[PDB]
Amino acid sequence: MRNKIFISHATPEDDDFTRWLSLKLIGLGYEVWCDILFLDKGVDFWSTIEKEIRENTCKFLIVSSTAGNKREGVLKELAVATKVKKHLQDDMFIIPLAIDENLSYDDINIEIVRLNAIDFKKSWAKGLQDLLDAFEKQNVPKKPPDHSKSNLLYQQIFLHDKQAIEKEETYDSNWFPIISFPNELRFHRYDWRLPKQFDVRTLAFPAIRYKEYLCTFAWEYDFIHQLPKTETYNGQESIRISTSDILSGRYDTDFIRNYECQRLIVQLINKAFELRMKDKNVREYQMSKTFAYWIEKGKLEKDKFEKIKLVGKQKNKYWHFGISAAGKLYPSPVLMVSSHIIFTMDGINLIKSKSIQHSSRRKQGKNWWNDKWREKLLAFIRFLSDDQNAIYLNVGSEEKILISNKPLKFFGKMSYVTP
């Protein structure tokens, strides 16, 4: 007995259509034999075909594309149906599926030139109606439609190659956890020594004006050259708030709440970075928000660090990998590092108009893939590090902030096979 609808096709030129014809067909209730659904592995691969076209194939559908008629494997597949067109002695056994808007008479194989056009050209749908309405006029066998079969295949067959797989994979953040914080956060009732009019971001240490007290991780003694007549402040007088308490929320003063203190550390952290970068070998790109830090040309041998390439070239403009430091407290206090692409027509003289920079960044962004954006960052933070495990940031002479140079690693079972 014979029930199938063998589909003969060129791959991958008519794959989009054959995969749509079979599956619309299979869900409609037909039995479709197609190379698309199997993953054959035998020498009988062709005999399987031949056995199936020979015996159980009720209808031979052939893709009538340009590629379909000139293709060795489909012409071989066609060979049997004409051999078995007589055996069955029904005229509509072979149905050319004219899916190609541009078939010259000459390409079409002689055997199927003669036959009747199933017209997928004008619309894929009208021809599906034409292929089935023709399946009404001669009684080709059918089951009651179960599209469930349809996509049982789609989901198991076509998607077999690429889906979520129980795989292990680790990912590296760009959050860089602070390691060590100064044992206390203290607040200086600076009073007469403080001048409000003065700006301290030239005070070479992270300082800000909170109320009338002075906030920093630099101990009162630390600002001397730019801050005279302050040997006058009692070392006791100043609040000495346990930092190891602040993260917890242990610290809540009704005079200032912890949310206030958590915000306050950041400017410092971010200022401490900004000062650290004043003296850590990288020219700075200024965005209004904060600074971006890009190593100039030639600083690393051949513009490579530890094997990575953090400066390069695009067109007539050099590119130079840059980063920023966001400091965030929560959930774990870390230094965030967003990655940038600065630009320079020459080694060390920055480009004037961002419009070019915007256009270059996007143009250059396209080259770097997930592997690339990771290494360079990691490298760049490996770059800055002033010892083996971390960076230093200098809040004061005896007080420092240490951030891990390697980001939290997240380990997740479930990943995808790489194509």
Binding site: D16, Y154, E169, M336, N370, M414, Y416
Partner: protein, 474 residues
Amino acid sequence: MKELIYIEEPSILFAHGQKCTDPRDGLALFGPLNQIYGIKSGVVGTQKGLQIFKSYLDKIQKPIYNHNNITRPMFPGFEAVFGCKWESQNIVFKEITDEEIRRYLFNASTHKRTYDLVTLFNDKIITANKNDEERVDVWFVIVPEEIYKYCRPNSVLPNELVQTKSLISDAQFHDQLKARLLEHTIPTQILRESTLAWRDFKNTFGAPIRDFSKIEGHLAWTISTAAYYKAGGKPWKLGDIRPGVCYLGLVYKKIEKSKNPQNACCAAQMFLDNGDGTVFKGEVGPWYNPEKGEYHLKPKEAKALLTQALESYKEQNKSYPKEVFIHARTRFNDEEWNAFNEVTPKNTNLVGVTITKSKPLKLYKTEGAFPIMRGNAYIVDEKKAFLWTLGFVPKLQSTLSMEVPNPIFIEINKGEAEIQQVLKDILALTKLNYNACIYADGEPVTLRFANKIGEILTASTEIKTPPLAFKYYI
């Protein structure tokens, strides 16, 4: 070394209750969730605009392929996909002429130039929709480039084209067009003459100004899916959504016009399992905040909102939902939620959720050019987590975010729930965007359309429009 859980990709359900993951593939395999009697399409453009609009209807009957048909599934042909005809033989045209275009367009003011073309189109639309015995399913606004070019704020038509000097010394035409047609409910799908005919708009070089050969079938997907949705039926449903949830997207838009810079129109969009959505329009109040750079509500308007939604819900679904999640990109102040709290039935669980796309925890896969696949999530607390609605997708074999993906901070700011369900639900909700037909929505549809919506709220403020399905707000 923290550990990521993984969220199974939510399944969206198409024709015959068969559900998969890609609408494009879900529609193409089975068609739409509710197949529809054929779209009657009406046109409001130049005599050229039709030929263009007709070019597309004819074009999309045939298949149109993207550059690579894995990362972007092909578009089989309108009828094959949706099992219904969107015919170009059957067009119901309301003409506009260059004389009309030139006369109203050339005004010195952008706003007097913008507001009037929009009024031109609506009258051309409203006369046809209201007056017509014949019925049109969607009105397609085919905008000649000359309109798109000049009908926005910050676009300066030269002082050497203006026929009339400005009578005295918002303004986005399309959103306005939707906002004015808002009071009388009509589906407006707005298209650009350039988009539909993009190879007939050559530049000075002779190549096309904007060249779309890479993605041309993708366009039909977005257009037809939206057109389809506008025409009546929704393409799909969320496949496995637990019964009786209510999603409420909180939208606001600062009204700049007010001297007092706190006038901000307000809204909430109600999604269930469909994403057909219901846009509850809140009236105008002092929502913007100077100190906090945030959006917030007084209780009394907030109660009305919650009720307006609970009630329209019960009118729709015959009960009060046993769970209501309210999304916004901001935290909630305790008074505003306690306002919600009171309105709510006693046993319905109300959840305020803050989906913030800050810039945190950019996760870089250790090995391979591709990024973390979407569905990976990091759970900070029982309350707060990190969701990757973006990143590599194997069925596509492409990253949704074309660079290194930014997950989304999801905090249960107010209420109590199970963060796992939240992540899940939110991952589910990216799937519901009918208009942009893609694999997934980067921002759950709850908030996805806030910013385009925000205009439409402000653009029309006299009206007091009833709660409306999205198709009117799109």
